[PDB]
Symmetry: D2
Subunit: 260 residues, 4 copies
């Protein structure tokens, strides 16, 4: 556990990121959360981290598709926490279309958030971690950082990029007490995936749960979703001493996706 | 933690395997240990698992280079434990030489133990795990299951084989409550590596600790050994609920080896 | 050979790209070249393709860091050639620095050219190839699309991205007569690498050829550079019938870099 | 082309190997063929290589599941040819079953032929190639050297092993003028695959060509078989000067299998 640690999770107002923040707070870390949503919902989440788990929590709104806003977000997060031990670069978006129809603005948006924000956030965090001789950078990539699917050019490119960037970060900081790894989930039933399930259901003329089964069966041999709580557990493991020499690698929780 | 669980670790009389057994016993599992060594040392280890950690422990001697002996070992282990929830296929040997000089008997020995024993042990364990709808198979591969080094033809071939076999096991048992993953360590300073350090030291005419540094610097960017305790921690993570959808993959704890 | 084929090579005014164009022209393709340099040198190269190899050649200046300029370049190339059978996405730049010092504008420039231009060029080319039921898209990635090195965050991220994008392109166009693959070279002694050799030489206080040897020895087991002509040969192979079912993959010509 | 070169192809009495031998003979190499079959068919193939392509051809019967027989085969091949420039390690077998039912003798047979014979053949060939400062070792692995499928434990393990062994061979001989690479095909409609198609057809109660379509659709995005002639073309490319710095890698011709 992580008592005393200071953690930042991007895109933690909902989905995987919120489960990350929750597991980190449970383990005893103070947490900065981030992302979009209804103000009342976000404040309920912030206050819940504090009242359930007895840690400090802060919400810092920053649109991480902007480089300077990301760099400023990290600075503000570190100021709030009084340090920065663990950075989870999680915020991301999706858009599906074939390449020749793929909107240029969607390409740019996905590269900006899913790839460039990881770079800018890392760049801002590293000097803090380097000065204290301890850090964890945990990038949320995807099975799509290792393999491809149709109609996901920007996302697959970005996630592959994140895997590469994770490696560079690790190598540059090897031996310094700082590790960087990429968690690579398969399907997790958040709203990012519910939209894809809904789209299949309309294409096929089937109920939503039949469509969820079809989505799993195509990619994920276990035929079960990965959960946000499982991913939170993986982040806590990466943050532990057992993972001191785990750096520059991918941790796939994907129900067998990448085994075939 | 793993209270009530029944674990078998091959090649757990010393080295990584003994640390695996220790962490599993600490987490509350009963443990079957296995491997060669001085009878008094092995019995001290068995009795220590019991008296420190309050679990049952059994030592079953089996030379796992023999298929039938491996299959019989699993049966005897399951009988002793009253079940079999977690199998860690760890036993292995090494021999370095270039291919054209590599002894045929050493090729055969390394394939037999480092690869075939994983198959035979898995084959024996699976029906037990399938009937109870829960299992963990944890194969100890290597960074050398993903990349190569000179003079390690048999070992690299075997370890790559283990990574492949891990994938097949995972896919065949997808959704059944059984996962199979391969831990892929970089250098860990056991006697298997001390022999290689000694060999460098003689080649270079340097003290042993200088030779250990040279061994690390060539391969392992962190310039630190991975520890057996870290690997034990990884095994405990793989055995946890957070890893229910982690299957068919590799968990590299290698100080950056495979990032470059 | 490629008589009658219509090829476009980005960044073919010098370096690898010019060797690509040359091999394609030798094989009988008409070629559009592209890139920066002295006008007289570029025109000499264009006219040389024609007079040596008896093909048509065109130079179209476009700064491919701009999306619309890339898309317009493809349209103009296809108009010049009367079609578009083979697209080699080669143009790229490099900049070395550690992450926390890595200029934001250099990150943006490298992502724009080395990754985004591949997307925009592919997007523009695909409908042409889809309508004729034959095409080759050949992306020039790197060993750094598969593994990392220090101080190359943007480039490694971009090149990993290219490998991902190559996979998506291949899958979206599977069976259509169009393949997409990524050539992943190790060191090739162009000006992009000569700058790095010069930088080592100054850091170490050694002559340039000693520095070239040091650059090779660190990464490239063969201790020899890959040549632009070899890479041109690989492109010609990818464009051949033997490669009709080679799609979505990487072709490493790297002197062993990625084997270890 | 390969005029004057001396090539050996294991398991070249039929299937992929015979197409390998044919392309090598077409390119001007003398060829030793090997494998089982009807004596009259094998002699017709040998004599055809000579009369169509004007090269010398030899058939040497050796059961390559035996180490010493493999090593002796290489010696006899080199004696027949007057040298040995190109070795294609192709012979292989398949057997499908789940792990817990997988015959021990089939595990042993597949490891012996598909993995160990590659080692023994390489070991025998290397000193010949080392003394002349030129060689090509071309191992026929599979998509199953990179990823898994159910019911193929031994084969996947073996093929992964071959990929590892290829890397070691390459690294040990880096810079010596000898390269070693693994061709990794997807489905090729030989008798090894026809048996699997027939098995699907009986399971599903469908005609053989429907079953062939189902076999492709599951794994191979292009929905077309790879041909033996394509693979022969890849071998000829690997043997060319363009591939002098291609070593230690995999060349996937798999219709997109490994892209997803
Ligand atoms: N759901 C899956 O199956 C899955 C699988 C693998 C990887 N991923 C990755 O996990 C991460 C989280 O995905 P999720 O499924 O929880 O998605 P989600 O849509 O449920 O949550 C996205 C989060 O990011 C925030 N966000 C969006 N745009 C932002 C911006 N410009 N700046 C700051 N925050 C922003 C949202 O407000 C939200 O908090 C993403 O990187 C995604 O690619 C998801
Ligand atoms: N040490 C490292 O750096 C390292 C790194 C990666 C992977 N590995 C792998 O970890 C595993 C353990 O290695 P280690 O370094 O602890 O080695 P070790 O030599 O210290 O221990 C080997 C264990 O296996 C047992 N053993 C040997 N032959 C056996 C046989 N025929 N049957 C049953 N048991 C047998 C030994 O008695 C001992 O208990 C091996 O598979 C090895 O390949 C080790
Ligand atoms: N040299 C190597 O060792 C090596 C190895 C692997 C991959 N690569 C890749 O090969 C490709 C070519 O590299 P190179 O070594 O020949 O480099 P180079 O610097 O010699 O040539 C780069 C080419 O791209 C052009 N170019 C640059 N910016 C451009 C822009 N904005 N728009 C259009 N054209 C532009 C240049 O004018 C030139 O024609 C790059 O993608 C590089 O990443 C090179
Ligand atoms: N067919 C495919 O889809 C496919 C795909 C990828 C890889 N492969 C690999 O390609 C290689 C050739 O396969 P194929 O499909 O042509 O099979 P095949 O069954 O058509 O041919 C096998 C060849 O090996 C010979 N052989 C068998 N046992 C032997 C032994 N003990 N000693 C010497 N020779 C022996 C046979 O006589 C025959 O010449 C194998 O390694 C296989 O794993 C095949
Ligand atoms: Na590597
Ligand atoms: Na895959």
């Amino acid at each position: 556990m992580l008592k005393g640690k200071k953690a930042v999770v991007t895109g933690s107002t909902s989905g995987i990121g919120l489960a990350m923040a929750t597991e980190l707070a449970k383990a005893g870390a103070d947490v900065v959360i981030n992302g979009f949503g209804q103000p009342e919902d976000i404040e309920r989440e912030r206050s819940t981290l504090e009242s359930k788990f007895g840690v400090k929590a802060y919400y810092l709104n920053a649109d991480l598709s902007d480089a300077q806003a990301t760099r400023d977000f990290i600075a503000k997060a570190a100021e709030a926490l009084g340090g920065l031990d663990i950075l989870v670069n999680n915020a991301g978006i999706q858009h599906t279309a074939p390449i020749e129809e793929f909107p240029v603005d969607k390409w740019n948006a996905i590269i900006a958030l899913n790839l460039s924000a990881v770079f800018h956030g890392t760049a801002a965090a590293l000097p803090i971690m380097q000065k204290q001789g301890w850090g964890r950078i945990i990038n949320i990539a995807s099975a799509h950082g290792l393999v491809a699917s149709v109609n996901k050019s920007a996302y697959v490119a970005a996630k592959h990029g994140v895997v590469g960037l994770t490696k560079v970060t690790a190598l540059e900081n090897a031996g310094k007490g700082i590790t960087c790894n990429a968690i690579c989930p398969g399907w997790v039933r958040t709203p990012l995936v519910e939209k894809q399930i809904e789209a299949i259901s309309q294409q096929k003329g089937i109920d939503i749960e039949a469509a969820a089964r079809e989505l799993l069966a195509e990619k994920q041999p276990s035929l079960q979703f990965v959960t946000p709580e499982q991913l939170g557990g993986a982040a806590v493991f990466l943050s532990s001493a057992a993972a001191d020499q785990m750096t520059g690698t991918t941790l796939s929780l994907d129900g067998g996706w990448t085994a075939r």
